[PDB]
């Protein structure tokens, strides 16, 4: 026998195949598993890992965030060079708060219809991942992008709301209930807004 105390602690849970039933996601996973094995690109590797991920972990992105980050990159980029292709393994959603966007090349798993319309009407084009594999087989001159997940309602509800320094939302159907003892100084006590970590 060999002393391996809690060696099971070092094993890590990693998705190695997709739970998706979508046949086209499976075709894309085939393509990019081949590209990640047979090329030196880090872009292909990360695209493959994201392709096998769960939908919750492929957060959607807004068109406005894409435009803003592409602008921050466009300055300090030589005006000789062309703008990178923005790549998101996920969904692109339209944004009503940004009417005026530049011509952008975007590759996404899916576009919302209004997002696709806005991108095209601004002069850009909507790509799929097979076209991207055709014209950027190693992901040269690309901008890999992720959507936001920290504003999610589930994230806002995580953790006990009655411990000092917590500001999580409680699981409650009635907003007016649970506004008393424990939340006001005049009702016995109030849970502290701040605690030093």
């Amino acid at each position: 026998g060999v002393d391996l105390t809690g060696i099971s602690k070092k094993s890590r849970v990693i998705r190695h195949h997709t739970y998706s039933t979508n046949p086209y996601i499976k075709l894309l996973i085939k393509l990019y598993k081949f590209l990640a094995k047979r090329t030196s690109s880090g872009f292909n590797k990360v695209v493959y890992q994201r392709l096998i991920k769960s939908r919750s972990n492929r957060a959607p992105i807004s068109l406005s965030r894409i435009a803003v980050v592409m602008k921050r990159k466009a300055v300090f980029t030589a005006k000789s060079k062309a703008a990178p292709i923005a790549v998101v393994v996920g969904d692109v959603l339209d944004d009503v708060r940004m009417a005026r966007i530049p011509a952008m090349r975007v590759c996404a798993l899916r576009f919302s219809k209004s997002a696709r319309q806005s991108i095209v009407a601004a002069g850009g084009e909507c790509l799929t991942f097979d076209q991207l594999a055709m014209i950027a087989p190693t992901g040269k001159n690309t901008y890999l992008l992720r959507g936001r997940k920290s504003g999610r309602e589930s994230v806002r509800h995580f953790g006990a709301s009655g411990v000092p320094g917590s500001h999580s939302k409680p699981y409650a159907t009635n907003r007016g209930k649970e506004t008393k003892r424990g939340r006001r100084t005049g009702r016995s006590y109030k849970r502290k807004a701040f605690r030093h970590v």
Partner: protein, 144 residues
């Protein structure tokens, strides 16, 4: 469906995941929300602060229709304009008209930067919304 549940996996395990020592007994904590101040106090206090006690004024015979007051911000006004109209709109020119109450809105709030100048007919408008839309070439017209 029945074939996917833990009961199928437990056929032959005798205890079905509830243990030999602590059994699966009937109501070992009491029923429902019993003992929220006695023996469930920590659960209630750490996950549902504010649950016990009273607060504020009563309002007998609350009618929600007289209180109907939905809001929309300045940077969302383009949701209520036809696609061709938002383009023929410009400061100093002929502007589209938005009537809020027929779109389901009572108050123009005024968060963000307005995207399409327009004339907005609102029952209510915040002071910042009014000033901000006037600076952009639009206007607010009160309605009832």
């Amino acid at each position: 469906p029945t074939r996917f549940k833990k009961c199928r996996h437990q056929r032959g395990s005798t205890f079905c995941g509830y243990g030999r020592v602590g059994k699966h007994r009937k109501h070992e904590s009491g029923r429902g929300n019993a003992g929220g101040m006695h023996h469930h106090r920590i659960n209630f206090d750490k996950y549902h602060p504010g649950y016990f006690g009273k607060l504020g004024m009563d309002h007998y015979h609350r009618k929600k229709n007289p209180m109907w007051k939905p809001t929309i911000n300045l940077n969302n006004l383009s949701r209520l304009i036809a696609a061709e109209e938002a383009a023929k709109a410009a400061k100093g020119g002929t502007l589209p008209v938005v009537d809020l109450q027929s779109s389901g809105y009572a108050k123009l709030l005024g968060n963000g930067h307005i995207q399409v100048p327009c004339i907005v007919k609102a029952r209510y408008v915040s002071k910042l919304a009014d000033k901000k839309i006037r600076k952009a070439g639009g206007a607010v017209v009160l309605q009832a």
